[PDB]
């Protein structure tokens, strides 16, 4: 009814420990969600065009041309790690657990409140807010996944990460098909590169509406909505990283001479000439057996063209890579391709008291060593006459195409049947948790944006809207915009995310890396004197595991 | 007890024929294993560094820098074909069988003998050997695979291939994490290329010890150890090779004119103009239908950058390839990338009476025709105007990067969704049998070092050690090395490897290739007048099978 | 092919699939890891570069 609550606030994470080292981690997340009535009650097909920016030669990477259907609905998205765990919970998970499973998801809307705003004609602004007890909130659960999948974490538009801070839903929109051509150029190109937007292909048109595709529930102040429990079928997520490169696979060479005194200058020596050694190599025309030429079971990681942009029907897009750059751990400035960069606002980890539109940014460096150091790569002749001469070796400094800033590694691909790689680690708090699998016939082996992928399906998107609150002067025949009473809603969203995790075991004599609070990061986890909070990112795959 | 044997010597291979053309091949292998007490009773973290060798410009491929934990334990490894089969058994297998399955593995240690050495003070050396009836041999079976996987076949350090020749175990060591950077150079580079060893990443440290990870059994002269039967879950291994290239897939063109007289100069002719023919091609802008342009179901084999070295956290390593070079069968000198080269000593096939540290070497040429002949490759313009002109074709002789010894094929990768390839053939006697699968999330489609791969796990590594035999003057507080009575052990190792194989069938009118003894190789299988034995390599995939 | 046609010339057609999984290589490019925009000549490899 009007004066009866329809739900309870719960934001507790429970760790129920099972037998055999397994734990059920049920994270509860409760938020107060504020929603305004849509700017327009219609669906719009809006073409965003920034040909001015890309008309500058060399700016083709800044292309934003696209077409989107803007809908009157808003999306309630909780597909981010920060929506579910605080730094203490994440510390417990990443320190005491070795693998993580995604078990189930539930969400519900309760304690719906709808208020109308009456603004007076007095010259200084003044307004009052009245409860509209008969107003309704339109809630649609796309449990069949009919609507396009538009996760908000990629735009930093999920629910807020603070239980005590009210959050908002994101206005929903989806991509409409378009055709676009953009010939790349550079500073110094003469003429106007081909840069046109060709329109839309009629055979690819797909105009979706929530009304025609999903059942819609009208919730009054005394109503509540529950989606029901959804159960995932994803793969386990490892909370351990691998450190072994191809150089550290298998049996090391026997050292016939060992150091007689400790110290950094004292080295063990194999004691056998490199061309007189025993072993197996894939180089059938050389007698040298070294750490770089000896046979290994397979290849850890792969090389791909980095900062390569491929053009397709809808324009250019960067070629993704599964693994981050090698050497970003020895030198943090080397983080670039494959090291995801997260930019977020005050709702999602940035200092809440900051002013301005500049977001808080961080580049994530994974502990796994599956990356590549292209500056140390090279190609050489099949003859393999050592030491190699100039014409028989292609080095990373050799120009490709006549460009001194482009080398073969930029266009180099080593993906093959022997490539072995890991899934992307969870990124806390701004990383996505689960992502829908592509509906293609042949599917990618992994996604670079979420550690869990939906093989069959994952829970339907939740859409909310303020039902039209018409005045007495509504005329559907009029071409002017619908006249509505200014209405807004505040409702409580509660979600339950259930994981299954395995407790880690100590396999080595030495201790391992753990996340800990210290003097440097001590104040990143507590509020300031005025209430300013923040959530800094945390690494997940802290403990190491042996690859081979 | 002291005077009671605890096992029997068995080195027989049994072929028990089943119904429906299947045979159980149980190979028994018995060896006398001699073990010396470890040089040191401690674990050492030894850094092998050869910066002197790689400081020579162009010698970066000879990098041996690495770090290893040297343990006081020795590894008993029987993961090689020669440990289980003699040339007659291998001939029977490769001639009468079409596929091979790895069923089970057992090993055991018995008839343990421990002897102490007493050396006299007399000026001419003289010594006696006494049985230490109360001395113990420490045996650890890592059935849980907690320790790093270090197969010895890659170093030619498995058990000997001769039943009547006593063998030794290999001292065990494993790779410790390290960071290394090496900028490639060539003869003619000016300056000192960046060449440093950066140390160890604390987050990747993994110090393993047998004592803290595996149960240890103390075997006295009257004790024996049995691991128990382990059962594999690997894929079948084909003993047949494929000969069909993309040029030999599907229906050949109809010959409207056939030769009227036999002879090498008389050819059949299609009789239709290449641009007037019927068929399907993937080239949508050409009317030519030829043997090189006609559509095929998929691609057999693939091209990859050969003799490409990729650098990662721990230095440079050669990029592996699944298939060997094409044309190595028409010209044995073309064997290079992908054709494994085996180097071994007198225990593993080399003439036992040879003197010197030079190993016996051979490059393996597989009968399967999945390789590539890069000298016959080329790229040309999408326009496809024939005959192609200079600027519209990139040939294998065209310099890439300005280097006349490097062409596009050196950096060329054609692996894709249409690539079809075979697993590596068994290499007798020096090839590995089974290999552990990588613990990565995404796993390689095959391993280039063993025909069988351990999906879940494969039998734990066996470690042996001589238990410390202290003197009366032991003082654990002393910083000097432990003083031990010089002790060594001789024990009998018996293993049983069970395979399941299918008998081959005659599918064609003509006979097929079989391994046979002849005048040229007659004396490669019998001892010399002084007992000198050898085991030359044998090819496995002799018979052909149709790919399509 | 039209059954009443004469000659050995076959009827031909190129099939264009409606799926948009193809590539437009004329719109592709590579550029330096530094990614300083607008990109200069030596830091970009274009489809027109030999």
């Amino acid at each position, epitope marked *: 009814g009007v004066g009866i609550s329809t739900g309870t606030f719960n934001n507790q994470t429970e760790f129920k420990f099972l037998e055999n080292g397994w734990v059920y981690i049920t994270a509860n997340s409760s938020r107060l969600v504020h929603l305004n009535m849509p700017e327009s009650e219609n669906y719009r097909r809006v073409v965003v065009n920034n040909l001015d920016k890309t008309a500058v030669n060399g700016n083709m990477a800044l292309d934003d041309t696209h077409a989107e259907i803007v809908t009157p609905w808003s999306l309630v998205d909780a597909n981010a790690w920060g929506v579910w765990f605080n730094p203490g919970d994440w510390q417990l998970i990443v320190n005491t657990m070795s693998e993580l499973h995604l078990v189930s998801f539930e969400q519900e809307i309760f304690n719906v409140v709808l208020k109308t705003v009456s603004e007076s004609a007095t010259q200084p602004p003044t307004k009052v807010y009245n409860n509209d007890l008969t107003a309704s909130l339109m809630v649609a659960l796309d449990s069949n996944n009919t609507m396009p999948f538009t996760p908000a974490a990629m735009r930093s538009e999920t629910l807020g990460f603070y239980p005590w801070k009210p959050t908002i839903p994101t206005p929903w929109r989806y991509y409409f098909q378009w055709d676009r051509t953009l010939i790349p150029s550079h500073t110094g190109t003469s003429g106007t590169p081909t840069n046109i937007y060709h329109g839309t292909d009629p055979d690819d048109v797909q105009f979706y509406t929530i009304e025609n595709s999903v059942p819609v529930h009208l919730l009054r102040t005394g109503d509540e909505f529950a989606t029901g429990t959804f159960f995932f079928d994803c793969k386990p997520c490892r909370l351990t990283h691998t450190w072994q490169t191809n150089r550290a696979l298998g049996l090391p060479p026997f050292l016939n001479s060992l150091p007689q005194s400790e110290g950094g200058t004292n080295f063990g020596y194999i004691g056998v000439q490199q061309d007189k050694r025993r072993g197996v190599t894939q180089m059938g025309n050389t007698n040298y057996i070294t750490e770089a030429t000896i046979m290994r079971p397979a290849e850890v990681g792969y090389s791909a063209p980095y900062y390569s942009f491929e053009a397709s029907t809808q324009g250019p897009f960067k070629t993704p890579i599964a693994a981050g750059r090698g050497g970003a751990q020895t030198d943090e400035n080397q983080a670039a391709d494959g090291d995801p960069r997260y930019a977020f606002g005050r709702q999602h980890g940035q200092k809440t008291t900051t002013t301005g539109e500049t977001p808080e940014r961080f580049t994530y460096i994974a502990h796994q060593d599956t990356g590549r150091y292209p500056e140390g790569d090279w190609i050489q002749n099949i003859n393999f006459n050592l030491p190699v001469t100039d014409d028989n070796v292609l080095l990373p400094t050799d120009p490709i195409g006549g460009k001194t800033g482009i080398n073969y590694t930029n266009i180099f691909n080593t993906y093959g049947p022997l490539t072995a790689l890991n899934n992307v680690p969870p990124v806390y708090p701004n990383g996505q948790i689960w992502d829908k699998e592509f509906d293609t016939d042949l599917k990618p082996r992994l996604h670079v944006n979420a550690p869990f992928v939906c093989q069959n399906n994952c829970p339907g998107q939740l859409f909310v809207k303020v039902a039209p609150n018409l005045t007495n002067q509504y005329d559907p025949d009029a071409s002017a915009n619908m006249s509505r009473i200014v209405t807004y809603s505040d409702f409580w969203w509660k979600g339950k995310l259930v994981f299954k995790a395995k407790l880690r075991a100590s396999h080595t004599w030495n201790p391992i890396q753990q996340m800990s609070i210290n003097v440097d990061n001590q104040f990143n986890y507590v509020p300031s004197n005025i209430g300013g909070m923040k959530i800094v990112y945390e690494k997940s795959q802290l403990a190491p595991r042996k690859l081979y | 007890g002291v005077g009671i044997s605890t096992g029997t010597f068995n080195n027989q291979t049994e072929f028990k024929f089943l119904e429906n053309g299947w045979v159980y091949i149980t190979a028994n292998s018995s060896r006398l294993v001699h073990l010396n007490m470890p040089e040191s009773e401690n674990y050492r973290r030894v850094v092998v560094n050869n910066l002197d060798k790689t400081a020579v410009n162009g010698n970066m491929a000879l990098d041996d820098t690495h770090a290893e934990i040297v343990t006081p334990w020795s590894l008993v490894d029987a993961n090689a074909w020669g440990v289980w089969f003699n040339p007659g058994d291998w001939q029977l297998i490769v001639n009468t069988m079409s596929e091979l399955h790895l069923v089970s593995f057992e090993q055991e240690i018995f008839n343990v003998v421990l002897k102490t050495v007493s050396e006299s003070a007399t000026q001419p050396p003289t010594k006696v050997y006494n049985n230490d009836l109360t001395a113990s041999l420490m045996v650890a079976l890592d059935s849980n695979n907690t320790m790093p996987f270090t197969p010895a076949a890659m170093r030619s350090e498995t058990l000997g291939f001769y039943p009547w020749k006593p063998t030794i175990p290999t001292p065990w060591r494993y790779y410790f994490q390290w960071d290394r950077t090496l900028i490639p150079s060539h003869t*003619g580079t000016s300056g*000192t290329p960046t060449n440093i060893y950066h140390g160890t990443d604390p987050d990747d440290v993994q110090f393993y010890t047998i004592e803290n990870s595996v149960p240890v059994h103390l075997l006295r002269t009257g004790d024996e150890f049995a691991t128990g039967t382990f059962f594999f879950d690997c894929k079948p291994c084909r003993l047949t090779h494929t000969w069909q290239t993309n040029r030999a897939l599907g229906l050949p063109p109809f010959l409207n004119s056939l030769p009227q007289s036999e002879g090498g100069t008389n050819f059949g002719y299609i009789g239709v103009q290449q641009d007037k023919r019927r068929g399907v091609t993937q080239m949508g802008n050409t009317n030519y239908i030829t043997e090189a342009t006609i559509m095929r179901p998929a691609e057999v084999g693939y091209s990859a950058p050969y003799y490409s070295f990729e650098a990662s956290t721990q230095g440079p390593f050669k990029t592996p390839i699944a298939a060997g070079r094409g044309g190595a069968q028409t010209d044995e000198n073309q064997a290079a990338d992908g054709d494994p080269r085996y180097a071994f000593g007198r225990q593993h096939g080399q003439k036992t009476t040879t003197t010197g540290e030079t190993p016996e070497r051979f490059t393996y040429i597989a009968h399967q025709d999945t390789g590539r002949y890069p000298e016959g490759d080329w790229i040309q313009n999408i326009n496809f105007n024939l005959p192609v002109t200079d600027d519209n074709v990139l040939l294998p002789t065209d310099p890439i990067g300005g280097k006349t010894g490097i062409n596009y094929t050196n950096i060329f990768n054609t692996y894709g969704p249409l690539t079809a390839l075979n697993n590596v053939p068994p290499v007798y006697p020096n090839g590995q049998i089974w290999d552990k699968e990588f613990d990565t999330d995404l796993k390689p489609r095959l391993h280039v070092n063993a025909p069988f791969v351990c999906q879940n796990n494969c039998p734990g590594q066996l470690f042996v050690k001589v238990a410390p035999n202290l003197t009366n003057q032991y003082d654990p507080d002393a910083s000097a090395n432990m003083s031990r009575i010089v002790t060594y052990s001789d024990f009998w190792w018996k293993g049983k490897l069970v395979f399941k194989a299918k008998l081959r069938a005659s599918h064609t009118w003509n006979p097929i290739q079989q391994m046979s003894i002849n005048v040229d190789n007659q004396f490669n299988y019998v001892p010399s007048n002084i007992g000198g034995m050898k085991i030359v390599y044998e090819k496995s995939q002799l018979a052909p099978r149709k790919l399509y | 092919q039209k059954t009443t046609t004469t000659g050995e010339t076959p009827e031909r057609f190129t099939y264009i699939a409606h799926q948009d999984t193809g590539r437009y290589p004329e719109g592709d490019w590579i550029q330096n890891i530094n990614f300083n925009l607008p990109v200069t000549d030596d830091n970009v490899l274009l489809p027109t570069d030999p």
Partner: antibody
Amino acid sequence: EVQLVESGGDLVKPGGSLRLSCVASGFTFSSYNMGWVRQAPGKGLQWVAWIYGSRSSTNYADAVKGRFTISRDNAKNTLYLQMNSLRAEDTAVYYCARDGGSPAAYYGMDYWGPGTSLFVSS
Amino acid sequence: QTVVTQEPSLSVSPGGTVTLTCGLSSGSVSTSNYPGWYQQTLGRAPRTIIYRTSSRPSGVPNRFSGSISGNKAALTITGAQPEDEADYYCSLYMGSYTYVFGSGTQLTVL
């Protein structure tokens, strides 16, 4: 945009010490390898010191090894060159140098400061 | 010790083409040396003309071109203007993290 300003150059007697301070603006200081070059009065440019990497690894020319120390403070966006046991041969104009390639170094001085003069005389 | 040799002095008429060369007494200059060219006027700090043997910083006129000729680095000024008269210094990356500088070339526009 990218600006480098050097200071601390002053007359100093032989055998003394002096710390040159280089203030950088218009760019992320910690993301670029920095260095100190020097030009003697009437002579050509000579590389003095280089600081590179997130670990602040340092390399020095043979003429200043053991005597010069190159350091950086990214919080202050400052580069410090501390010279000890100064000699008459160290008298010169010292230029701040910034490499423009953060993830792929140009291995060359992308930006230069106005320079600070140091005179060593008894 | 590494020594970089370049022409002590060079001359060019207005609107002409001049080439300044930078070599090594022992060895050859390649793109692995990342040759850099810097321009210095009287009483002013050096200005970067070329980096990575081909790249001129934004604002550098196109008349300055960097290349590798023979076993040396080459800086070519085409249509040389009066303001191009200055001391041009060549920097070679000598591996590891060591840099070397040439003696310098005094280019005067007649």
